[PDB]
Design a protein around this ligand. Structure first.
Ligand code: 37G
Lengths: 11, 229
């Protein structure tokens, strides 16, 4: 869960 | 007063804080778009969802932030998101930042479906924080301190955040005792406002409730960081 944030952190 | 670990720490943070992240094209809508409760809400939603991204990028560039547990990295973001927006908006209103279009931003907030119950406290905060006459340095450090809060709920390894926050707290005090020998209670004032900032988390949850029941939608990004279920 909370995938969008993990995507921004890893961006 | 300003050691070599600190002078370099600060410049990294101000270099981050100054990275003009919010697009002019976007923020320009505050000024140019029609004024109405529906359009006011839409524009504010676009600012917030864009700001969240700006926050993530600024957070990432915080010293030793990426060396943290992944599950704790999220709990800090979800925990500080609102408080960080109140700080940036406050800066807009207090510093009259051109990009913010203060007076029209205020028009939109005051007519976006927010109960007077929250409007009154919200702008009271804005006024008092402005009366602190903070510097951009302070605004930046406070934001960094708020983001790296070990009080956040659901946090696992609290002490590791405290390890990244303490240094920032000290630098801030250094900028209070040094640049403000006039009144050493200045640092305590700042911390006082932080407690006041925390109060808005509850206000914000209720504002979201009201918007939701009135068929207002947010973005996937905001739904996630705010747990709009
Ligand atoms: C989802 C919406 C409707 C919402 O819900 N609660 C609040 C809300 C409110 Cl109404 C008050 C305080 C806090 C929140 Cl979260 C909001 C609006 O949030 C924001 C977020 C961020 C900006 C913001 C940031 C930066 C800049 C900027 C620059 O940096 O150059 C220039 N213009 C800027 C605008 C404004 C409003």
């Amino acid at each position: 869960d909370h995938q969008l944030l993990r995507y921004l952190l890893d961006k | 007063e300003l050691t070599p670990d600190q002078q370099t720490l600060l410049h990294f943070i101000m270099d981050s804080y100054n990275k003009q992240r919010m697009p002019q094209e976007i923020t320009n809508k505050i000024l140019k778009e029609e004024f109405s409760a529906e359009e006011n809400f839409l524009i504010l939603t676009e600012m917030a969802t864009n700001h969240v991204q700006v926050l993530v990028e600024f957070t990432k560039k915080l010293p030793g932030f990426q060396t943290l547990d992944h599950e704790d990295q999220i709990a800090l973001l979800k925990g500080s998101a609102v408080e960080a927006m109140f700080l940036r908006s406050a800066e807009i209103f207090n510093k009259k930042l051109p990009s913010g279009h203060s007076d029209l931003l205020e028009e939109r907030i005051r007519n976006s479906g927010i109960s007077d119950e929250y409007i009154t406290p919200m702008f009271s905060f804005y006024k008092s924080i402005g009366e602190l006459k903070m510097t951009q340095e302070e605004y930046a450090l406070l934001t960094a301190i708020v983001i790296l809060s070990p009080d956040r709920q659901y946090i696992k390894d609290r002490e590791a955040v405290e390890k990244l926050q303490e240094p920032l707290l000290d630098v801030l005090q250094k900028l209070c005792k040094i640049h403000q020998p006039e009144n050493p209670q200045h640092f305590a004032c700042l911390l006082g406002r932080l407690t006041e900032l925390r109060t808005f988390n509850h206000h914000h949850a209720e504002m979201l409730m009201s918007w939701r029941v009135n068929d207002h939608k947010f973005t996937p990004l905001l739904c996630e960081i705010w747990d709009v279920q």
